[PDB]
Amino acid sequence: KKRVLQQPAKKRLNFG
Amino acid sequence: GTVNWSVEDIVKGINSNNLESQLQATQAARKLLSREKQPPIDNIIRAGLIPKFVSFLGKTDCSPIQFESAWALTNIASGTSEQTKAVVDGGAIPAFISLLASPHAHISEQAVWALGNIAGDGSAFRDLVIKHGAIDPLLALLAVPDLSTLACGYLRNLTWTLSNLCRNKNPAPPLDAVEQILPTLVRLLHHNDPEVLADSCWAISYLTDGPNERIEMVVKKGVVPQLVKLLGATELPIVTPALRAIGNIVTGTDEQTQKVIDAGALAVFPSLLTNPKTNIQKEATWTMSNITAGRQDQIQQVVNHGLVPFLVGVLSKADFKTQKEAAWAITNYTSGGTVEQIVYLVHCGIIEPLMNLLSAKDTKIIQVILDAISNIFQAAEKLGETEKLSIMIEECGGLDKIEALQRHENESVYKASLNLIEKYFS
């Protein structure tokens, strides 16, 4: 009866 | 000085036998890979520079070249799965893990970031990073009396990398690794930096997205109250992962849902179900549908918190996906609830928006709404009020829609509408 269902960046480039 | 070098000049400098020339060229490569444009990662890889950067990662006598090469490799690993694979195949994982223990904070930070990108590639590289022994030094970097003494960006990067180590499924992270990381995650969940809190809630959401044993591991650490507290937060980047984690948790056993309820989560749902962000509204309605699928006492808790009127509201006006989650919540309510609770539901005015939603194109929402109406009619049958419910569904012009659905393409919708109209509308 209970049914099932990622914002952060999986990868990030370092710009500074 | 090191601005706008050509990859050819970078290779020339790196291939020199002069450590200062190599350092200048490596900084040039880092700056080339740091531009806001899509960096020239493929050109750097084709030149065969990854092995040289990985070797420079081990030069403890030249911390600057360690830092520059770590930054460059981080940026390379930030790209496609193939470029991250190129970084990993150069042997960079153990080098970064060794650099995690560097006395310089910015080098350790770059190592954390690189390992985070590698793990974020997917479950295979995540498990590989874990197998090389990264969790121990990563968690050691946070073995401080007070997290407030750490640099803001440093702690943020550590938290993000840990969240990526908790991320992804098929397979999910190793159980021993999750158990090794959870305490630090709780500690971070009690921190005050909004970005740390967001990343920690996302890690908890990752860990709770699975079978009931993962949910149980998470719940036993006692984080549900803190998750509800953060659910009441003002910053959306915190509320979103907190709500996702609470939803995941309520997808499990009735005891886990009961932990969610006992923590006072329902008291927050009046605002969540009216949140300006449609995504928060949909996630909250889905959590509510999972809660109404539980025991009758839990449905009664939902009733006592005055949330049935909010369910009627979202069913009456909301984006179609939220309305679909609300239809699911109503169907679960009616299937699991007593006739008294179903009567209360009707008294709150569910019938009119439930009928209004029957003009939808999706056949799934149609069949679930028909199931809800069937449950309601059964509840009314036990009360002898079935003619009352008939007059209700006919007064708002609803029976017309059921008659129209009688000719639906779906066999299930066809048969359910026919049965309803033959028994209760003849």
Author numbering:
A (entry chain B): 122 to 126, 164 to 174
B (entry chain A): 72 to 497
The study reports:
As such, the structure of AAV6 VP1-BR was solved in complex with IMPα2 at 2.3-Å resolution. The IMPα2 structure exhibited the anticipated α-helical architecture across the 10 armadillo (ARM) motifs, consistent with prior descriptions. AAV6 VP1-BR interacted with IMPα2 at sites involving both the minor (ARMs 6–8, P1′–P3′) and major (ARMs 2–4, P1–P5) binding sites. This interaction pattern is consistent with that of a bipartite NLS. The observed interaction encompasses a buried surface area of 1,230 Å2, mediated by 6 hydrogen bonds and 1 salt bridge in the minor binding site, and 15 hydrogen bonds and 1 salt bridge in the major binding site of IMPα2. The key P2 site interaction involved AAV6 VP1-BR Lys169 forming hydrogen bonds with IMPα2 Gly150, Thr155, and Asp192, alongside a salt bridge with Asp192. The linker region between BR1 and BR3 (residues 127–163) cannot be resolved within the structure, most likely due to a lack of strong interactions with IMPα and the overall flexibility of this region.
The AAV viral protein 1 (VP1) N-terminus controls the capsid’s ability to translocate into the cell nucleus; however, the exact mechanism of this process is largely unknown. The classical nuclear import pathway involves the binding of cargo proteins to the host import receptor protein IMPα via a nuclear localization signal (NLS).
